[model samples]
Target chain A: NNSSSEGNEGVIINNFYSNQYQNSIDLSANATGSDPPKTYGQFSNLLSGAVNAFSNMLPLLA
Target chain B: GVENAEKGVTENTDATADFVAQPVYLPENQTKVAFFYDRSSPIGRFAVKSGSLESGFAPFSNKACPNSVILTPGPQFDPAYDQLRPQRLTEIWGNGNEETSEVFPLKTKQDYSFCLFSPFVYYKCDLEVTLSPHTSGAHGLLVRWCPTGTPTKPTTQVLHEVSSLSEGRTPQVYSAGPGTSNQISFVVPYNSPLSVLPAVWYNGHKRFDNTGDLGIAPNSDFGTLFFAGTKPDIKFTVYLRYKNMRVFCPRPTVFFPWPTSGDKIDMTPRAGVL
Candidate 1:
């Protein structure tokens, strides 16, 4: 939104050219769901699950 | 009065029994207790004892005492990695064959990958126990680590000496609201390997009824056994109030280091003393 746009901002601007407003609303709506995303892998309760996810995803990425 | 009940002691059943009341005594410099392994950073260990909070973790394997140092901070960079090579921080864990993986002995044959986020070389763990599991119960924290087995009997380790953070007789369960979640943070140093996550410990026994929450029952005598899962690469900020917590490394340079050097004791002492 600023004149000195670069890097991440430029990438986002390019995406906006396609469907900027739509993506924002989608992410925000997902976040504001009735059962909003309570947590990420930051707590021990979810660490093992996160590790398992990473372990499974690496093979596909490779 | 409640104080009188505490002062009371059971009397001998046999009327003719020789009465001898010995006072509990402890000597200074006496070897107190220990954890499962060394209390160093990136790869710290804790026994049921030592309460919930540990002394401090070691930043490096052969790093200096307490393994603490000031870090020169700056914005992130990639090409500048080599220039700052010698000035490293952070540490990693789980560098081992199948035998040395976390959850050892419990499921030795099976393999699992787990690590903790400790941007600093060392980190310290502090604990505040709850007995009522909730906010208004007789909740407390207890850690049991004792020697199991007799010379001729198949030994089994048992938990002893419970500790608590409850003022006195609080409920075993507490309700949560907007931002209430049980958490424990380990402050790791930068430039070190990502160590395996801190193993979960609830009460002294395994999970209660297999429920992940720490405040479950039957086994929830004082409180419940909560969950001990893993965490992601979130930053663990050391608060100003907790900056001066206790920290001590394990003894002996061998496989399992702890409190100090050459301070190994057998299960017999643990049981006998407890």
Candidate 2:
């Protein structure tokens, strides 16, 4: 249908699932990815991890 | 009834599973190992499968055969891999031994052909096809032998980059190995200047008489040949190869690169692999 905006969400999700599913299956049972952070806690963890990733940046503000 | 913003997305039904899942994973550097074996090499055998798994998932894939041709003393000849001749004025011709010539106006085109079983029903394939045109002059085969399928004709173009002579001979070779005249080819896809990757990979990339044909649509018939030479004939042979039919799944967000500190490290400086 090529609606792409919302109609393709299902397709997008399917694709996201395909890559992650393939990768996880190729690697480990605990492998969960390809999907963007969908939860608040998960999102926060990613954001915090990214921000804190640069220890130098944290001290640079000081 | 769920009054939370994140809850609109629904709580993870499996949140109770204690083993926390890794939030990120990046693909490793892709290895460029050869898939096809040399004719002289011993062949390996396989065990028969009890049954088939579904349509898309197959273990082994077919490999394209190699086509090589050595150049006899010709105009495009590069004395050694390192040293060669140059061009003079007014499209000069090289020594007859050397098959080089300052031929002007080389036009390139691509036509994609895919199999469409009669009566025209849905079609699919799980094989790797390759098109490697030799590059003798300003053009060369930009494809490597890796099969992929897709619905879109990528915007990638195979280029042949050879040294132009201000004055000297080029090179020439007789038809020997797999020639593109009969082989199928495709137009490359999804490439940008900053991040450009040829859809196909060719050999040393030198040829004059051969231009590959491409089967573009995976399962659509191109219909009977429609063109005449000099006048208008059916089944006109043209130069240019079709792109590989590789299906790409986006929204496939990978953990691109983890930041060591403030700066991010490009784990995969080249895309596609990661």
Candidate 3:
């Protein structure tokens, strides 16, 4: 967007990824909900259980 | 003035009569280890570290585990091992067993030179010794009370006046007082083909109220029961009884070879002095 052809270079690029100008709108839409994901073990208390979901799963990826 | 003096006298008498030593309980985590055996098999011995185990357990006869050591309030309870309460420390097969004795250490001002804490006080121990028949040169449970961190002649350390000898397997129970020193060894001698069971129960005391010999006093302090003897591998049962808030005299964490530094106690005493 910065380097246009020579002197004819007055190009302005704003909101690069913004796309609110959709012309087609679908009328048919629905929603569904599922129970939250769960994990087990190392739950000594409520304080530990609250953070264990993220704390226990990250080690496996590492 | 007369009324004030009468009130003061009444208050002092009440304070003396109402004085009762605080009840002490064993710590939740301290575990005392012990060994147990039945007469059916010379090798049928079981081990239990105190705290969780019931008073009596099912006797399992397997010579594979001849010696067992129990530590009270053992390491923090693990969920994985919570089910394995009263964990067995060792198990060896057959009568030729060399079991390491449990050595306890005291952290008080008292020197390890005596068996119990102080000489002016008389500590009581409920001893239950079961000696089986043996022809391997007359060996029963030999308990030696002497000094720690110092040396003493084996001839002078034997508690002939305090401990007793048994010839048969009739579960003998008696009370004994510790001599003045830190070294106390309840040796389950190896001379016998059968495993000897020697267990002692102690009700802790604080101190002797009067400095006089064997004076009565309110229970105020704790005492350590140091155990040391031969070292071989076997699974056996040991018993440990303790109280709450009771100071646990730290025992030797690692095994120490017996009688290398001090003059050993005389194998036999002249009878009537421990």
Candidate 4:
């Protein structure tokens, strides 16, 4: 439970949801944020967002 | 199965909401502000309400007390807020008579003496104050009071810090701090070159010498979760008062609060000492 890794989608999803507070200053419905995501993403939005977020880093990460 | 993220701060107002959720006790403060800092925020500055609603979960938050503390000698402090000026170390032992609107109060540990009818569960509030070296003129940061008639032993300590001279002092009516003595104290001069924060009562653990880790956990990664930026660097002044526990900062000061979550501490039966 202490160590964090990747690959498990459920675990990733759970971690993503639980730690969403770090994404933005205000995550309310009205406030808008990108760094610390402002709104709660739905299944489609979240998955797509994660793919978009990490995929872009591939250029530098790889 | 469903997949999603960002369910935490959808309705968030106060950035300090997540940290102050647990049972945090102060010595009878008269203000709505549990904590005060004018750092970075959507609003220029805001105070943590004594009690607040947790992030994301905003349903049953009737007990939430919006945190608010009035800046005493304020409303126009940028003009005449003398004692709090960083360069003027004279405030630590001021020949002048002035009290700040933002004074952090510390006193003898007072708790509910009677046992909780619920269970043998209690808490350990390891309050760690993070400060930059501002008041470094005199002996250090002198935490003082006139001393009450019935002077109780001070319980605060310099649990942790980054320098050598940072240790506890004997509590008189005047100056005081740590290691479970009487007055809640740490470094009197408050001199530490740390980025994470300031002093906790340190007998000899990470007193910053790396002498020993004191068997304390890493406190996990609460920094990114609590602090504004993921940096966790706070700069402020710890002016010890009796009731109003206020701190002032020229720039921004972050409180790296160590709140104990869940109840698993000292669960022995007849544990009425909590």
Model 1 has a DockQ score of 0.01
Q: How does model 1 fare in lDDT?
A: 0.23
lDDT scores for all predictions? Answer: 0.23, 0.21, 0.24, 0.22
lDDT of 4 by residue, B125-176 (tens): 1122222222222212222221112122222333343111122342322222
Candidate 3 A-chain TM-score: 0.16
Considering the two chains of model 3, state its CAPRI-style docking category: incorrect
Superposing all C-alpha atoms, what RMSD in Å does each candidate have to the true structure?
28.6, 28.0, 31.5, 26.5
Evaluated against the true structure, the overall lDDT of model 2 is: 0.21
Ranked candidates, highest lDDT first: 3, 1, 4, 2
Candidate 4 reaches a DockQ of 0.01
Q: In order, what fnat does every candidate score?
A: 0.00, 0.00, 0.00, 0.00
Q: What is the interface RMSD of each candidate, in Å?
A: 22.0, 16.6, 42.9, 16.9
Q: Considering chain A alone, what is the TM-score of candidate 2?
A: 0.13
The residue-by-residue lDDT of candidate 3 on B83-158, one tens digit each, is: 2322321111222223443222211111122222222221211122222322223212222222211111222222
